[PDB]
């Protein structure tokens, strides 16, 4: 049944575990939120452009160019995709510690207890008071995109996904998508004589796509007694591994054989002289086998062009860089460490006066990192003790430029390269992503662990059907309408598959553990606890605590 | 089920295609709108007349006479008939390009989510604020005319049909129909001494028809939980052809045989001398066969009296002229090119300051056009090189009048005449029409491609049942009542039949294609895209891109 | 699914110099014929 | 931030210092349309001739 | 008769002159020494620039499969018998698997 | 430049290297990483699972 | 080329390919084995490997 | 001539027939030959590689 005065759904946020057999777990995560929806600020679609004359007009500022072209819509999307939505911090600890790999299974979603209210103002004498009252006949439009016709638009990009706190209400992300303006921009250094083109092109007859929610899809009209239920969507994806790899290229294979065991705990072991050592190496003209030059099964990780900007018709952009360990060289960019900026709803702390809170995610998987300053290329024919001209060192200048070194432009990717798939991030991390429709596809998307093979889960779009006053002129440029807002509950169920880790190691494994307050380490428990006034903060948890044997 | 707080319908505007077999397509077009209905400005029927003393009082202004007699009704009609309602511009492109002929099949309609609200004013001190609130007990009257008892009154005539934009709300057209006043008016030229009768007659006992919605039809009363559904109406109509004909009367049949192929690409071919040529001609006393005078199977298109005004009892009116190609003579009227005037809702642009936007539709089907200035009649017995007195040329004066020429009054229509049926127009075009009840019927209606053979689809009439105050005097001349307005959704489904075009031609066919902005051609894509502020414009698309072989 | 009209391959009148001028797909007086590359993939697509 | 007033006017965005997003650049607090993280590289530079 | 086929798929193109590499640690408004610009000389050679020898292909790279050409285009091709095979042949849209 | 230059791309095809009768390795185990090399260098055969 | 992760500097592998008439072994990644009498060598050889 | 057929929703079977008259000449040599082209003129001068 249903109707006004009868609630159409229930609130379940709790997470469940079930053991299907040996090592297997079915993780069923419920999540529910109250969502606050405002009447759209314009009833009609708009094609708008941002263009920076101030930033890009001055020389050398290219990196900050924001210029693009977008289609603004009245619709808003409820985006359930982040890790921080589905799990509470302890459930993330329990999973990160105990399980080798995890995989997505199904997703369900529902909307219920729709409530639309209207606002009037009185009496305007002294100070106005705003009176709130229901419209029982009003409705809310709801459209799900099953076929992914519309441009796929993850909200986590801007951190607009549903809030991470069950008890706080949350808001939708207004739906919008790109349009093709064909920007032109020119390259300069800090102080340079000349001009900068900095122009944007006219609309393209070939490339112009304009989509409309109403034309594209079926819209459900939900009044207070109505409820909407998405069917069960089943993921097809590859599981991801929850245990990090420590094992470098130089740790692969059989170690050399030591001559004899050391006498005392301080003493170092010794090896057969490199001249007489037996092994396999690709160096020519020298009779040696040494731990550095011996042949390894594959390359682990690879050098990458870093802080390079490639420019197609759209404009300059930094190409992605696969997340890899930061070596002791501390250099973040060459290894592609992610850096998030996020608000109080998703993170930060309610005590913080700053507008946003920022965190750099330094990758685990210590095997694939690259120290940039210590990488070097050596001349052929090979020689021990190269003179300066026989070795390519990072300290030298490239093209006569001081701060540009070969490791900037150098690219090692090849058939022999192996790297681990990067890791999920509990708050602020993206759970899944849609695969690009191109024929030749990337081996991984950079931000998202899971990539739906065929068809991604559909986007869920909502808006308030307009409430019109007595006077409505369809030809009028301006539209007067009744101030209106609404609220509704969103409930969803995400099922997962995971497998317990075996532990064969003698020694204790590393684990995620809370720590007493008063010591400054990252895990101090005060940060997961409320304050006196209720200010709460939610910070990224390390993932993949447990080591793994690569080879 | 149903009730307050439970929505009675769904919103589907999308268009579907299905392939029934070889070449056949079933096009199912859904369309949906939000409709804004105001309480009628008078509760009772009225018989009113407009009579121009100012326009027609002065001499020679006859063409602008507006005088008529009409029955004004409180009811309003929801009129779904235009092409611009059902299809989006791309769906019109896809159909116009790929299909030879299309035909109507069925029509469905529904009304749901009725919402009635009332308006009060307070406190009138400082500035008044208008408070809006529901009447859950109020109802809306809905009457469909299945039997076409009432005068058939297409709203597109005045461009009052439902708006062409799915996301913008739209308004009904107030229902009204003609009544017979028997006007009298006299003919004068620009400055002339005399008087003009310019009178209108008394009501006629023979000809007076006064219809009332309540007496005529069954009315459904719809409250907020109620919904109304029209049955399925099935068209009986003849399909229309979507491919234009280029083939003139002089392109019919077998060409003459050339003597020999030309030597070079510049050289013209030569034909057997006209004295010796073999053929068939109706000219007498001359031994010739020439491409102009040879006999053709039929006349393609025909000369027409153009800008003639015939006057029955009602008054002077211009008789219609079948749409035909405009020849290189550019003359629009002789070939009957349609000219539309329409508003922002149906067209125009929201940026335009003008009240209306006007477009002249120049007919495709290049075969049937008539250059007026170059048509001529020649004396009998026929002669080559006629002296001035043997030929009737358009340049000569008729009846001693300078600008009146024989091509004005000349009428070629005969048994041998063949012409193509004119073409649909995506915005502003009328889909169907009802056939006149006269015994001897026209071969085509001029504006509408489809004409329902027996019984046209019914007219859908709606009004708000009156809300009365506490004081109601049935004998009072004036009626006070509660200010009331309402909104509801209209949804309809139009199924079509169409057939894919075969292409036997070597060369590429002409097609409707978008074009880059910045060039001024009619198809520049900017015109189908929103502006920054949301201003959108919708302009007529060419139809029948593909050529066809007449004979 | 797009509102606006899609781009299409279309012949064009002779006398304008654009690549699609129809004269190029038609024979000459002496029969000389020319066949030139046609654009492919006229219709835009949504990558992501 | 808001819809533009007239068809000529350009829209404006949240200041790059305060913008929320994801980028791989280090040591700078910004999010700008050029440096933000994208799912994959589309096309690639190539040794040519 | 000669014709240059300019690829459609406007997404994957590269303007060469405007591609640049920037030094680490990153900085806004790089001075000349912090940025690698196409205009500079490589190995002291005038017309040789880094974009000539630079190769971006990596795991993150996605590109569309090129397009057929109505006259003069090759319909199919045979796949090389090598063990490790190219992801696409350049001229031919279709490549027979076996 | 041939020292640091890397031509590997989508168009690249190469034969799988060859076994060596004495001193050659018959098989090898595949690394447990998610994204795996197309071949191990020394060993002709690589056990899938 | 020698790339260095946390473990230390190491030469990255190079797929075996033909040595061209340029005789250059390293660029084409030609394998070089060192082995003892048990697996090879000769029992007459005085050398260790 | 070329034919089209619609197998269902959205699917088309395109069947293209083509036919030609072919003109074959007696081969200019009855036996196999192993021939080489070598440019002394083009490649002899510098830079023409």
Numbering used by the authors:
A (entry chain H), B (entry chain Z): 37 to 587
C (entry chain Y): 540 to 587
D (entry chain Y): 295 to 343
E (entry chain Y): 393 to 490
F (entry chain W): 442 to 490
G (entry chain W): 344 to 392
H (entry chain Y): 50 to 98
Article excerpt on this structure:
Members of the rodent protoparvovirus I species, including LuIII, H-1 parvovirus (H-1PV), and minute virus of mice (MVM), are utilized as replication-competent vectors to target cancer. The T = 1 icosahedral parvovirus capsids consist of 60 VPs, with the protoparvoviruses assembled from VP1 and VP2 in a 1:10 ratio. VP2 forms virus-like-particles (VLPs) for members of the protoparvoviruses that are otherwise antigenically and structurally equivalent to VP1/2/3 genome packaging capsids. LuIII kills transformed cell types that are either completely resistant, or less easily infected and lysed by H-1PV and MVM.
To enable comparative analysis for identifying the VP2 determinant of selective tumor tropism by the protoparvoviruses, the structure of LuIII VP2 VLPs was determined by cryo-electron microscopy and 3D image reconstruction (cryo-reconstruction) to 3.17 Å resolution. At this resolution, the VP2 amino acid side-chain conformations were unambiguously assigned into the cryo-reconstructed density map, from N-terminal residue 37 to the last C-terminal residue 587 (VP2 numbering). The LuIII VP2 monomer structure contains the core secondary structure elements reported for other Parvoviridae structures, with nine β-strands (βA-βI) and an α-helix (α-A). The conserved jellyroll motif contains eight antiparallel β-strands that form two β-sheets (β-BIDG and β-CHEF). The LuIII capsid is ~280 Å in diameter from 3-fold to 3-fold, similar to previous reports for H-1PV and MVM. In LuIII, this depression is 4–7 Å deeper, and 15–22 Å wider than H-1PV and MVM, respectively, resulting from multiple subtle side-chain differences within residues in VR5, VR6, and VR8. At the 3-fold axis, the single “windmill” shaped protrusion is the same height in all three viruses, but is narrower in LuIII compared to H-1PV and MVM, and has the same curvature for LuIII and H-1PV. At the 5-fold region, the depression appears wider in LuIII, due to a difference in the HI loop (VR7) residues that line the floor of the depression, and differential positioning of the apex of the DE loop (VR1) results in a 5-fold channel that is more open at the apex for LuIII.
